[PDB]
From TrEMBL, chains A, B:
Protein name per UniProt: AB hydrolase-1 domain-containing protein
Source organism per UniProt: Rhinocladiella mackenziei CBS 650.93
Record-annotated AB hydrolase-1 domain positions: 26-143
Coiled-coil regions listed: none
SUPFAM superfamilies in alphabetical order: alpha/beta-Hydrolases
Gene3D superfamilies the UniProt entry points to: alpha/beta hydrolase (3.40.50.1820)
Pfam families, A to Z: Abhydrolase_1
InterPro entries, alphabetized: AB_hydrolase (IPR050471), AB_hydrolase_1 (IPR000073), AB_hydrolase_fold (IPR029058)
Length: 263, 263
């Protein structure tokens, strides 16, 4: 059944994490906002397809907020993979299908490249390689301003405002606090460290996606890199948060995608 | 400086065309709506950068609506390419830099494939290779419903609704009659006919664009095929009508792209 709890790791981080189901492992890493409650409904669905699903709030974010300051500053996919790895060890997850959007997509690839042996297959979605105009000075302003701004930016990029609002008051209060921390630690340093070099993308299976309704320019490069490299590239319904806006379809893609690599 | 007129070709089409400027030929093929008045400003800008610019209302559309039934039904890029060659011959245009969006883009590629001796360089924009669900039954309904649905869809996909509205009432009155005719003859046949096979794309230079704001899924495959084929691919500001939403940027792109293939 769904287990909800904490575990503190050797690196200082008090992770909030959730688990459900049984079978082969699926890890659901959050996008930059670090809020694993976005995964709630799809988590049940994947699990019920014969999977053990793991997810967690990200370091410094939400209920994982009791963490060391460096674990949410100067963030890269590789920094994040390091922490995920040491968390997976405590949970005895040896090999996993790994999903992530945004900076969490940065993390998928970082793991695919740096810890290939722990990735059965990586599912990155919208790897930041250039930030849009709206983020260029997001780290320069005040917390309240960022929370006001980033809540509308995320809300607009929800891909389904009904479902985005429907995440609820508890979640959006947590998100209100993550927004500022996210701006100070993620936007500048995530795109330039995107592991999309040739030598990152071929050590294990990768199925790349982009949001169906995301404006082409935002992750245009994602599609060209994947095509050039012969990496499976496609879309999913919605935009930046398919697991929230289109939970069923998202959970079907994870299931379908992971399915083809099981042996 | 600008000439406007008609020419009935041996295939029975009564073409409305416009020319302006002097020098190497640039041909601007409309999108599915077939309304060459959308090219008014860009056509002025391009021509004074030292080009003879030609455009036209597409067969059966707008001021070229006096055309035989076959010329606006079961439409493919290749059929459109065939009528346009026939028209180009009668205007003594031997070789041209050619732009086109949508089914215009289809025609650009079909021109690049089957009439390579006529193309200096190809500028396709948003080649339809599949349809969004919004068009899947558009050929099945009555005209007034199509005109109501398709005006909003094109307005929504305009890239800049102010300037779309600013095309004026006379332009939109012609579009009103173009919608059903486009729906009955284009959607079903254009995508399956897309000349995007390997042998279609390496006879003349191709510079491929997709609207910066356009939902990724709409022309996602365009970016894949171009990246796979080593064909230059980029974005333009806006969506489906970059010549309407951003005249100056559009004309700069066309001018500079084509200049680079003069000799
Ligand atoms: C906060 C989240 C939703 C933010 C939604 C949003 O504003 C869309 C812009 C896309 C950029 C996302 C992004 C970019 C980065 O450089 C680093 C990131 O961690 C993210 C990212 O996680 O986006
Ligand atoms: C009418 C125009 C703008 C129509 C506005 C619009 O519906 C945007 C959707 C993109 C699809 C365009 C399209 C698809 C086809 O199969 C054939 C076409 O001729 C077009 C196309 O020309 O769309």
């Amino acid at each position: 059944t769904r287990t909800r709890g904490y575990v503190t790791t050797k690196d200082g981080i008090k992770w909030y994490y959730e688990q459900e189901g049984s079978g082969p492992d699926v890890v659901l890493i959050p996008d930059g906002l670090g809020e694993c409650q976005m995964f709630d409904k799809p988590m049940s669905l994947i699990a019920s397809n014969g999977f053990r699903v793991t997810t967690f709030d990200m370091p410094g974010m939400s209920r994982s907020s009791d963490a060391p300051p460096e674990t949410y500053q100067d963030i890269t996919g590789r920094k994040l993979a390091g922490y995920i790895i040491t968390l997976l060890d405590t949970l005895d997850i040896k090999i996993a299908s790994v999903w992530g959007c945004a900076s969490g997509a940065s993390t998928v690839l970082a793991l695919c490249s740096d810890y290939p042996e722990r990735v059965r297959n990586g599912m990155p979605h919208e790897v930041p390689t250039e930030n849009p105009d709206i983020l260029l000075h997001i780290h320069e302003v005040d917390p309240a301003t960022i929370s006001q701004e980033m809540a509308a930016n995320s809300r607009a990029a929800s891909g389904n405002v009904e479902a985005w609002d429907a995440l609820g008051p508890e979640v959006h209060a947590r998100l209100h606090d993550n927004y500022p921390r996210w701006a100070y630690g993620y936007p500048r340093t995530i795109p330039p460290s995107a592991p999309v070099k040739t030598e990152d993308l071929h050590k294990v299976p990768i199925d790349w996606t982009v949001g169906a309704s995301t404006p082409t320019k935002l992750f245009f490069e994602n599609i060209v890199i994947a095509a050039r490299e012969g990496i499976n590239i496609g879309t999913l319904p919605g935009n930046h948060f398919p697991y929230v806006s289109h939970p069923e379809e998202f959970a079907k893609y994870v299931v379908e995608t992971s399915r083809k690599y099981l042996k």
